[PDB]
């Protein structure tokens, strides 16, 4: 089997991407944030505290003939920005882009933190990291991909995110029309539950390439590119007036600037992030200070190849017995 679904930025900054997902019978379509950095599929629901729902579409398990309470199961998760959610669990039929999993754990939120309430366009998350990170207790649950994997034509999914434009998640096949040149595959470590890999270095703008190993994760659920402070300083030093602002919480730059590209290494191949992809626009409406799309990982403890990086590439998440990641230019 295969599936293919379009993913769409939630706002003019590409802060996140949402993908329609069918849950239950008859289908209830919710727009979920596909997150290769976590492993829970959770939704706003008829159980979510009413004061914490503000415009989201909710899943109502009592209206699904295929929903079953996963008795005694609870979940509770935090994300890297400090956002969080928790609740109980149903199993139900879940379809993405024509690919169906029966008996998928659908984690129903009883509580969500303020950032989720505020994101009226995000109806929940669909985790695509390894199932070892799933938070359901006492019986850990599998991700949608892990459940689908054995049925797929090939045990893979691909992320083809757009820059201020829609893109595609495919399951089970590699669309050879979606990228240029070749896909370079690189080894993955699952030791922390992530799609964790080692970039071979970087370049800033037209500069020469610096060969250096950068361990990090491929995370569609993170907006920005978080890299070591050394690398990030070398990038922003090329932008007149750019500086790290403690009040804003990262590097800002004059909105009058034109940003250099940033290249990262995948084996002997290179992915070039255009400078425009690094511009997140005014820090507040009307400001002439713009927020940078490359930020330090120093306070996080892990480097994160988030959407800024991934949207410059066609990315293969190969979930074969020995997992790998593939990157191609596009
Ligand atoms: C701090 C620290 C160390 N580590 C926990 C950092 C990491 N953090 C992650 C993710 O929590 C998983 N992916 C990302 C994600 N955030 C969201 C999201 C958050 C709020 C609103 C909407 C979406 N969705 O996905 C970040 C992996 S490693
Ligand atoms: C312009 C503009 C809007 N604003 C002033 C700047 C922006 N801010 C963002 C965030 O993506 C939103 N959440 C923040 C955050 N995320 C994490 C984090 C992510 C993953 C793992 C660990 C930590 N830490 O802080 C930055 C986009 S534009």
Curated annotation (Swiss-Prot):
Keywords: Aspartyl protease, Disulfide bond, Hydrolase, Protease, Signal, Zymogen
EC number(s) from the headed UniProt entry: 3.4.23.22
Disulfide bond residue pairs: 255-290
UniProt-annotated catalytic positions: 35, 199
Domain Peptidase A1: residue ranges: 17-328
Catalytic activity reported: Hydrolysis of proteins with specificity similar to that of pepsin A, prefers hydrophobic residues at P1 and P1', but does not cleave 14-Ala-|-Leu-15 in the B chain of insulin or Z-Glu-Tyr. Clots milk
Molecular function GO terms recorded: aspartic-type endopeptidase activity
Any one biological process term the GO annotation gives: proteolysis
EC top class named in words: hydrolase
Family statement drawn from the similarity comment of this UniProt entry: Belongs to the peptidase A1 family.
Name of the protein in question: Endothiapepsin
Lineage, top ranks: Eukaryota, Fungi, Dikarya, Ascomycota, Pezizomycotina
Portion of the parent chain present: 90 to 419 of 419
């Amino acid at each position: 089997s295969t599936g293919s679904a379009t993913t769409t930025p939630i706002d003019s900054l590409d802060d996140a991407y949402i993908t329609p997902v069918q849950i239950g019978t008859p289908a209830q379509t919710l727009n979920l944030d596909f997150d290769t950095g976590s492993s829970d599929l959770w939704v706003f629901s008829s159980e979510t505290t009413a004061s914490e729902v503000d415009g989201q579409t909710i899943y109502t398990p009592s209206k699904s003939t295929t929903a079953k309470l996963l008795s005694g199961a609870t979940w509770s998760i935090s994300y890297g920005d400090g956002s969080s959610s928790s609740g109980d669990v149903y199993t139900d039929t879940v379809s993405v882009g024509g690919l169906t999993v029966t008996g998928q754990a659908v984690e129903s939120a009883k509580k969500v933190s303020s950032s989720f309430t505020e994101d009226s366009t995000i109806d929940g998350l669909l985790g695509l990291a390894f199932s070892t990170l799933n938070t359901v207790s006492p019986t850990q649950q599998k991700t949608f991909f892990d459940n689908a994997k054995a049925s797929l034509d090939s045990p893979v999914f691909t992320a083809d995110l757009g820059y201020h434009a829609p893109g595609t998640y495919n399951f089970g096949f590699i669309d050879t029309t979606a990228y240029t040149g070749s896909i370079t595959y690189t080894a993955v470590s699952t030791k922390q539950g992530f799609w964790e890999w080692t970039s071979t270095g970087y370049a800033v703008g037209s500069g020469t390439f610096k060969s250096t190993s950068i361990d990090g994760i491929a995370d569609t659920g993170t907006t920005l590119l978080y890299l070591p402070a050394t690398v990030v300083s070398a990038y922003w030093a090329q932008v007149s007036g750019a500086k790290s602002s403690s009040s804003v919480g990262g590097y800002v730059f004059p909105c009058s600037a034109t940003l250099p590209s940033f290249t990262f290494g995948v084996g002997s191949a290179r992915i070039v992030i255009p400078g425009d992809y690094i511009d997140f626009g005014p820090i507040s409406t009307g400001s002439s200070s713009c927020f940078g799309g490359i930020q330090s990982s120093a306070g996080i403890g892990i480097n994160i190849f988030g959407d800024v990086a991934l949207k410059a590439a066609f990315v293969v998440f190969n979930g074969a017995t020995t997992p790998t990641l593939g990157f191609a230019s596009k």
